RNA sequence: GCGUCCGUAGCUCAGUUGGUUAGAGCACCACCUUGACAUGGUGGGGGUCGGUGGUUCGAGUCCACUCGGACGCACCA
RNA sequence: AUGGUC
RNA sequence: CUUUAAUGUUUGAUGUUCUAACGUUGACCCGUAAUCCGGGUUGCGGACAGUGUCUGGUGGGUAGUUUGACUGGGGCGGUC
RNA sequence: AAUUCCUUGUCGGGUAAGUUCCGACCUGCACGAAUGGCGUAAUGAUGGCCAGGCUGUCUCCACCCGAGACUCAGUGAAAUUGAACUCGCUGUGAAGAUGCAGUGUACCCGCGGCAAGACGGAAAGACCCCGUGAACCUUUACUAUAGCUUGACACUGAACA
RNA sequence: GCUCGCCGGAAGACCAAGGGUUCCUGUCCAACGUUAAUCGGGGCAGGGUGAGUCGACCCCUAAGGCGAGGCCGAAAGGCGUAGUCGAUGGGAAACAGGUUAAUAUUCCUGUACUUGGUGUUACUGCGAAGGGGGGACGGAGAAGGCUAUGUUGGCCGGGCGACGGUUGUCCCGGUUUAAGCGUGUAGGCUGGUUUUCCAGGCAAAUCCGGAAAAUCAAGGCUGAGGCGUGAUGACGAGGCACUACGGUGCUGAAGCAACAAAUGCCCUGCUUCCAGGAAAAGCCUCUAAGCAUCAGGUAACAUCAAAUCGUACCCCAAACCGACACAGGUGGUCAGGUAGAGAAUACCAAGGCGCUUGAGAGAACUCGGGUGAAGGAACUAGGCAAAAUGGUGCCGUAACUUCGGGAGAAGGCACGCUGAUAUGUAGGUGAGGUCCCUCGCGGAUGGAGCUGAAAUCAGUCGAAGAUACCAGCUGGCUGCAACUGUUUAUUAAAAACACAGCACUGUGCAAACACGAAAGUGGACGUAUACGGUGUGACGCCUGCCCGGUGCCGGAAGGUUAAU
RNA sequence: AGGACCGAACCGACUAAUGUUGAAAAAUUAGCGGAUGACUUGUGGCUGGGGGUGAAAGGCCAAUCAAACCGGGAGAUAGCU
């Protein structure tokens, strides 16, 4: 977690994140597949979400957001750098030869014996549904409908905190600071997610965008007025309210209308 | 310079070819507008 | 150089609020206080509201133009 | 709350 | 009639419990060698949401047009 | 100052001399804090200035060797063009003459050049005006629209309180 | 035919693209050819393209196209599952010599190698639509082991020199041999082997996976090049019988050794980095379905296959793209000498061309260049152009700073050849000689021979020793922008745009948002430490007042109020 | 180790002289910049005229751009030569 030494302009500002716990080798073979770079264009072949395209060959690693196997214990084996998401991924060997990939909690190493299911004992790494968890303990991989897969709280270093267990519902507090009702029998996993200092990483130069697949971004008041509202002026001028490309206000105007979910939103993020 | 015509048979038969004119219903009218005026070079297949 | 706010006491004032009847802060000191200077008070003059007209007895006041300052200039290579 | 200056 | 308020009704609003209409980009079994689709079994949601008709607001996102003449050349002042 | 019109503002270095440059003053016509302030090691086929080295850049241009231009042999175009036996001057005059009026010099015709004129020749002028002529662009110009959301009715059900 | 010149990382030798007789052999000069023209890439006519192994189809896919049913649109249709195609990549096999005027890994010469059935004799487990192993995969980096390759020796044959000298440590050539086939070296990887049981791989598994015990200490793979065979064969100095100046048939010595060395190969291996590096098949294994010993697989022999298609020629140009036989452009393969860090550069061999108009005279002027007395930017908008510097080694090197930089700061000093140290050293390589031997492609002691820096000291020639070709002008204050980058193909490359960073704000997932009337897809098989939008632009110090307009966010008791 | 340095291939195109019915309807000769990275390049596939693509100049989209190319309404209309 050190700054790189300033040999030349380009490494003057780099702070890496290095980790020696990882696997310096090849991934587990029957768990890969193909995730080709879609290039930001759909079946109609047009750019719909911009800035994307370029980079490096990202081979997908399958990972088990369900953890369905009750009862059977599971030893951890090693950790690996899954290049899709910003977390790290543990490789798990169960007691009968089945290997899987799971998300890595904060207190993980090679030697832990996790256990999934209803009757799991309470220790970080374990999973169990939220009418047996005790209140206050912060969890990750929270599901919104029972059995779908780990959906809430799944980034590098996030968590959600169970605050109230009333009726047949539970109430969370999500990482974006919004409370939320969830069905009382969804499959959550105790403890946080491991690699907690991704936000310390300053990339350093232009090249760490286009080794990650982010193209340039041209700001609005560069263009000529047939391409964006902000254009024009014989010099510099921005004499108009700040908008999107497509007309709408951007500096504050709320854009939520999904009115079939408002039974569960208890208070907005402020 | 790098001029305008750069030739390729495997592109020409897929762009201006007969089986390129096949599936497009707006291209069946094009073949039916070359037959019904009677050209020799119907399409650029060989 | 459309047009505007407009134009006043020793200093800025308010008063055109579709018309009639005169309002100030500060402040020149004679005196009331304090041993002695103001911080307070009585007081007298100080506006034909730049100029010329008209509707009008009653207009600083309802207005067309003139000097002065701010408030918008595009066209033109 | 009133009580600067010489 | 000034003008109340108790027996019954004439009809729209405010809220709650249920489910059979609809919803399921929730799991399981079949067509099936098939994650698209369809069939039922269930769980959750449910009289909402989503959609058609008219109406109010917003709407240079997008469209069609206007912007006078006189003038010791036009714009600017005047003038009609 | 990339922004400063009166302006070459004012002073001091730099030069014999310095409307540009570097350093201070502030009377800033009209800088100024994320359409950003001030500052800064390295870097730039970047803007501006002085110094040593170097010489035809120049005072002042001289010679030399090669591919053309000049002659003879073969092939052999193009722009233009009412017609043509197509001189100078002073004056007249769509008002800036090879011709008109007056006057004065000049045997007819080629190659090598120089480019002042024939308002020379390619472009039905782009500049301003005229066009109740159009394209794109902007907005609190006019009039309608996609999309957004508001309630009524249908899909729409029973009790309830 | 022989003097001269030019390229020799091209303008030499080949192929995939693209063209489509331009290829060779006779004959013709009317148009074509920028001239003449007997010559041709021109006109006519005739010949010329031989495959089990090399390229296309072929078994399997990637992006992506179509897509039975299916869903959704007014019809056209729009997507999209099962499937079906798509090379630019994975999948069986051949090398050398010789001949044609014009084709050869294609025909002939000795020698090969693989893939199919069929039919024999021997032993019994075979199976596809699923299961598992394998195919199977970045960037950079250094070494080690070699080879194509070159040089000097060894040898064989020829030469005694147009003028000084040349019987010798002298001059010139020649020294080539493949695929395949036994062996398991340099070097790299993995511990093997026996047994009980299991909830897992969509059902079974006796192979993969995972617990368990006994042991055995090296089993198995990988693999460049020499090494043995291929091969008493072929090639080769040539002597040379005809001989048309066409060539033809026999014949034919040496055919070894050292040294250097790649960008090729062991290398799909090793180390290490963050930006974490494909598929299905061919190839092997595995089973319940079932055939119950007919099928079916695995060994030597024998049989025939192995069809069709394309092969001439140009392919950095005269045959393709550019209207021209165009100073234009176009992707891959091979890489000789003497210097040289080197694919730069200067001269060359192998090989190719003198670019389809010339012969003259020696004007102004213009293009491209070499030289210059005195001065050295006075020229001009401006040191524009030109001149100059320019390599290796050693001493040395300022303010400023983000500690790296500035820096090759600036300035200087030696450099040719000859001899000695050393008749060729330090170093590299390495043969004999000898010892055991866990054995073979040995392991050590060993130093012959070859190759060969770098330095010091004397001595010498010129005006001048990086001599030619290549090969930085330096320093002093500022304005802008952190920088590396990028765009106005075709008048502006800059101070414009970008970027790492900061900040607001939207979005809890069937996300916001975009392309779509609509299904669906991007967003992402991502989940607030994530994504979209706006604006400024590293880093250091910092980011203050104004909510009255105008946006936007929150409030819903009051007045105005649509449809109904 | 390098979005490192000097430098050929390769990519780009800063200045000046040639030449602007030239060898070319944008090049040549002497100089220049980058040159293990945000690079350069052969093959194939995707996007589509009010729409595509844009490290943003209204650039580029078959030698054509502030709305391409071809056919049709169309013998569009014209107070103007
Ligand atoms: Mg983005
Ligand atoms: Mg940004
Ligand atoms: Mg930007
Ligand atoms: Mg612009
Ligand atoms: Mg707009
Ligand atoms: Mg401005
Ligand atoms: Mg402004
Ligand atoms: Mg009065
Ligand atoms: Mg007093
Ligand atoms: Mg001007
Ligand atoms: Mg408009
Ligand atoms: Mg007018
Ligand atoms: Mg006028
Ligand atoms: Mg300045
Ligand atoms: Mg200024
Ligand atoms: Mg000025
Ligand atoms: Mg001065
Ligand atoms: Mg100054
Ligand atoms: Mg400013
Ligand atoms: Mg601001
Ligand atoms: Mg640059
Ligand atoms: Mg000077
Ligand atoms: Mg010439
Ligand atoms: Mg001539
Ligand atoms: Mg002649
Ligand atoms: Mg005459
Ligand atoms: Mg005259
Ligand atoms: Mg005359
Ligand atoms: Mg002339
Ligand atoms: Mg002339
Ligand atoms: Mg003239
Ligand atoms: Mg003219
Ligand atoms: Mg005209
Ligand atoms: Mg030569
Ligand atoms: Mg070279
Ligand atoms: Mg011919
Ligand atoms: Mg012939
Ligand atoms: Mg001829
Ligand atoms: Mg002739
Ligand atoms: Mg020929
Ligand atoms: Mg011919
Ligand atoms: Mg044969
Ligand atoms: Mg083959
Ligand atoms: Mg596909
Ligand atoms: Mg389809
Ligand atoms: Mg169909
Ligand atoms: Mg296929
Ligand atoms: Mg291919
Ligand atoms: Mg292939
Ligand atoms: Mg398999
Ligand atoms: Mg590699
Ligand atoms: Mg060798
Ligand atoms: Mg060799
Ligand atoms: Mg002799
Ligand atoms: Mg002699
Ligand atoms: Mg010899
Ligand atoms: Mg061999
Ligand atoms: Mg051939
Ligand atoms: Mg040939
Ligand atoms: Mg060639
Ligand atoms: Mg050519
Ligand atoms: Mg041409
Ligand atoms: Mg020629
Ligand atoms: Mg020629
Ligand atoms: Mg000549
Ligand atoms: Mg001469
Ligand atoms: Mg000279
Ligand atoms: Mg001189
Ligand atoms: Mg001299
Ligand atoms: Mg001067
Ligand atoms: Mg110069
Ligand atoms: Mg020079
Ligand atoms: Mg820059
Ligand atoms: Mg580019
Ligand atoms: Mg340009
Ligand atoms: Mg999706
Ligand atoms: Mg900016
Ligand atoms: Mg800035
Ligand atoms: Mg602020
Ligand atoms: Mg307020
Ligand atoms: Mg406000
Ligand atoms: Mg509101
Ligand atoms: Mg370019
Ligand atoms: Mg330029
Ligand atoms: Mg050049
Ligand atoms: Mg370089
Ligand atoms: Mg570099
Ligand atoms: Mg259009
Ligand atoms: Mg174009
Ligand atoms: Mg248009
Ligand atoms: Mg009509
Ligand atoms: Mg017409
Ligand atoms: Mg008409």
UniProtKB/Swiss-Prot annotation, chain B:
InterPro entries the record matches: Ribosomal_bL34 (IPR000271), Ribosomal_bL34_CS (IPR020939)
PROSITE patterns for this protein: RIBOSOMAL_L34
Family: Belongs to the bacterial ribosomal protein bL34 family.
GO (cellular component) term, any one: cytosolic large ribosomal subunit
Keywords: Ribonucleoprotein, Ribosomal protein
Example of a GO MF term: structural constituent of ribosome
Subunit description: Part of the 50S ribosomal subunit.
PANTHER family for the chain: LARGE RIBOSOMAL SUBUNIT PROTEIN BL34M, MITOCHONDRIAL RIBOSOMAL PROTEIN 34 FAMILY MEMBER
HAMAP family named in the record: Ribosomal_bL34 (MF_00391)
Record GO biological process: cytoplasmic translation
Name of the molecule in the record: Large ribosomal subunit protein bL34
